Amino acid sequence: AKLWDSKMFAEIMMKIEEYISKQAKASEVAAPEYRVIVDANNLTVEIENELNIIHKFIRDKYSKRFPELESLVPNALDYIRTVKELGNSLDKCKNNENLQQILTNATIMVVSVTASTTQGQQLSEEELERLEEACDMALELNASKHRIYEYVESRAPNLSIIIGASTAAKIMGVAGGLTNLSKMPACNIMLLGAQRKTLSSTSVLPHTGYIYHSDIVQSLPPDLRRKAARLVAAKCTLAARVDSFHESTEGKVGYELKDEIERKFDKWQE
């Protein structure tokens, strides 16, 4: 009913946002940049949700030809690519070179074995074309997501040294600029970008965002991740302040703080 409607609405929204992003990328060589950065950050979530609904649609449609494939390929993009590559003919697991670019040899064996005894029936040509167009829409949305992520990475030497460049951009955009970030307590920076995550509480990680879900924090055992978050946030705050005055542009402070964080992690894990 609203499948193509949502597809077109997201196409228009992504067209506007990607025009803005490509204009910024071209211009790389009162309407601040962090505004478009946060816009892209939320558009990423929108794209993820749209990809999820598209994946659900594809699963429901393809569950009559190869009902068992969903179990073997839990990942969304991999499942979409596999259904695109197999189509109505399940005899494409034999001597296939594209399938080896999506899955591992073990799961290729498993899917080939399962396809031989599946009890599924053929799809009509109309259903096949609907599935193909859905897959193409998913792939183009994924390409748009990749472009957004490239721009988001391209977009504060010390704060970036401590935590990447993507997370720094996310936290500064949600804060509303580097100056606004510099004048917040660390306990508030720790909570920038935290959802509510309705229960269906310990299993939800109630108070975590943009620092808990970071490369350097997720790089620890779960039981140490909250403490680490705190620590990182603390040091991040310091770096932010040093950045708000344009001092230590070489990143010396960031390197020192990262070394201290690494020493604390090592001591925790000894």
Partner: protein, 124 residues
């Protein structure tokens, strides 16, 4: 000698008065220790005045506090040693920033007002 950027630097006599008043405030439960808690008090508008140490190693980690104090119309001073400030605050670690908060009907009001007037004359 200390740092040009810690502009309103108190002298030994005013330093002694400030540390004594900070000790009294700690005894009266009217003190917040740390730059984060000083920032929180400034945002909540419950701060009498802010005392910072002039020997913070980068010293840019507490230079947002003078700007916040100007925005919120609160006096501020710099002391020379963070060890002394931490001792006066009631802890053994160094402290680089602290805030004296507002309590209704407290007996320290006169001393706080005198210290505020003394601080406000240092900005020349």
């Amino acid at each position: 000698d200390v740092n040009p950027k810690a502009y309103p630097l108190a002298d030994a006599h005013l330093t002694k008065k400030l540390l004594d008043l900070v000790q009294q405030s700690c005894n009266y439960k009217q003190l917040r220790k740390g730059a984060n808690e000083a920032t929180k008090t400034l945002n909540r508008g419950i701060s009498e005045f802010i005392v910072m140490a002039a020997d913070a190693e980068p010293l840019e980690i507490i230079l947002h506090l003078p700007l916040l104090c100007e925005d919120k119309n609160v006096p501020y001073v710099f002391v020379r040693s963070k060890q002394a400030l931490g001792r006066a605050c009631g802890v053994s670690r160094p402290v680089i920033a602290c805030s004296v908060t507002i309590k209704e009907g407290s007996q320290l009001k006169q001393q706080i007002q005198s210290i505020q007037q003394s601080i406000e004359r240092l900005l020349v």
